[PDB]
């Protein structure tokens, strides 16, 4: 069909979704996220084998992440259940087709977890990636955090999150995050060919395995108590002062000062 924030394209049985939010740098706004969900929903058809997420060629930034302004004021949980990021990720995961991420430019925060949540990840030799909840003082959620612990080692993810610094593709590759890393000029082709090949295969097989794999990576559980406990700390980081100072600094585009409360 036709979407406002997105741009779908079919090549054989390969669908390619292109982000069209250049004005907000492809920040994760509900509006955007919603369209992305409509476009996927739409593409859930027998004729479609493999999907592909991408940012317009030339892009300097894949996605800047969550839209701060859209962040909570400090009344509820930002990272709620029905929060845009939660939905698309759950969605992407339970999606019966393979979803490749062709990355161009930089990825930030929520983007990283989003593309992390996909099945494959091909990237330009130049992209960079960085997890940044700490730069603003955000107490992510458990699930969000989990989805980042399925490829790279703990120490690595810890380093990622902790310093909130950006890593290069080459590194992100070496640590087992991305599948491949190509030269810009070759990025599209490469990704395409792969999607075509994968689409030569038994769609029904793929759907089940991807579901088994999903069912497995979630096989991490804990008691009632333990959840509320972390949830409590979560709440407490919200109502924090360092918190507020976190947004501000940014909005005021000034370097923040964390106190410890
Ligand atoms: C954990 C995480 C935290 S929430 C957010 C995580 N996002 C980040 O950590 C990325 C922060 N954004 C940036 O580092 C940068 O904007 C970056 C690298 C994308 C571009 O640097 P740049 O020099 O090319 O551009 P810039 O700094 O001039 O920013 C240009 C414009 O984009 C806006 N802008 C950038 N990122 C965001 C965002 N996430 N939400 C809302 N507005 C944003 C700036 O406020 C600004 O608007 P005006 O100039 O009109 O005022 C998450 O839930 O995702």
Q: Is 74 one of the catalytic residues?
A: no
With b for 16 or more beta-carbon neighbours within 10 A and e for fewer, the 136-160 pattern comes to bbbbbbeebbebbeeebeeebbebb
Residue with tokens 């107490």: 139
User: What token pair was written down for 21?
Assistant: 């939010």
- Whether 88 is in the pocket of ligand 1, judged by its Cβ within 6 Å, is no
Catalytic residue at 140? yes
Token pair recorded at residue 190: 């490469």
Method: X-ray
CATH T-level assignment (fold) for domain 203-260: Lyase 2-enoyl-coa Hydratase; Chain  A, domain 2 (1.10.12)
- What is the best residue among 23, 71, 108 to mutate for testing ligand 1's pocket, by most ligand atoms within 8 Å of CB? 108
Measured from the CA of 130, which atom of ligand 1 is nearest?
9
CB 15 within 8 A of CB 9: yes
What is the DSSP code string of 187-237? HHHHHHHHHHHHTTS-HHHHHHHHHHHHHHTT-----HHHHHHHHHHHHHH
Architecture of domain 2-185: Alpha-Beta Complex (3.90)
Find the catalytic residue in 5, 21, 137, 140: 140
CA–CA gap between residue 34 and residue 47 (Å, rounded): 23
Indicate the pairing of strand 14-19 with strand 6-11: antiparallel
How many Cβ atoms are within 10 Å of 246's Cβ, its own excluded?
23
Q: Give the integer Cα–Cα distance in Å for 144 and 57.
A: 28
Whether 243 is catalytic = no
Region(s) of the chain under CATH 3.90.226.10:
2-185
Torsion of CA 63, 67, 68, 70, to 10 degrees: -170
132 in ligand 1 pocket by Cβ < 6 Å?
Answer: yes
Cβ 110 under 6 angstroms from ligand 1: yes
């Amino acid at each position: 069909m036709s979407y406002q924030y997105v741009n779908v394209v079919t090549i054989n049985k390969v669908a390619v979704i292109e982000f069209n939010y250049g004005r907000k740098l492809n920040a994760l706004s509900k509006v955007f996220i919603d369209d992305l969900m409509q476009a996927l929903s739409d593409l859930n058809r027998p004729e479609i084998r493999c999907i592909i997420l991408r940012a317009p060629s030339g892009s300097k930034v894949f996605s800047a992440g969550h839209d701060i302004h859209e962040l909570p004021s400090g009344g509820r949980d930002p990272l709620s259940y029905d929060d845009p990021l939660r939905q698309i990720t759950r969605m992407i995961q339970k999606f019966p087709k393979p979803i490749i991420s062709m990355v161009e430019g930089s990825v930030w925060g929520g983007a990283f977890e989003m593309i992390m949540s996909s099945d494959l990840i091909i990237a330009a030799s130049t992209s960079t990636f960085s997890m940044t909840p700490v730069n603003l003082g955000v107490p992510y959620n458990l699930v969000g955090i989990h989805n980042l612990t399925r490829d790279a080692g703990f120490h690595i993810v810890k380093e990622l999150i902790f310093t909130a610094s950006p890593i290069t593709a080459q590194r992100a590759l070496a640590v087992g995050i991305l599948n491949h890393v190509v030269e810009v000029e070759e990025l599209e082709d490469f990704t395409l060919q792969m999607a075509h090949h994968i689409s030569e295969k038994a769609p029904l097989a793929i759907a089940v395995i991807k579901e088994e794999l999903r069912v497995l990576g979630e096989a991490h559980t804990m008691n009632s108590d333990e959840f509320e406990r972390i949830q409590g700390m979560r709440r407490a980081v919200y109502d924090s002062e360092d918190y507020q100072e976190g947004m501000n600094a940014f909005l005021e585009k000034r370097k923040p000062n964390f106190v410890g409360h």
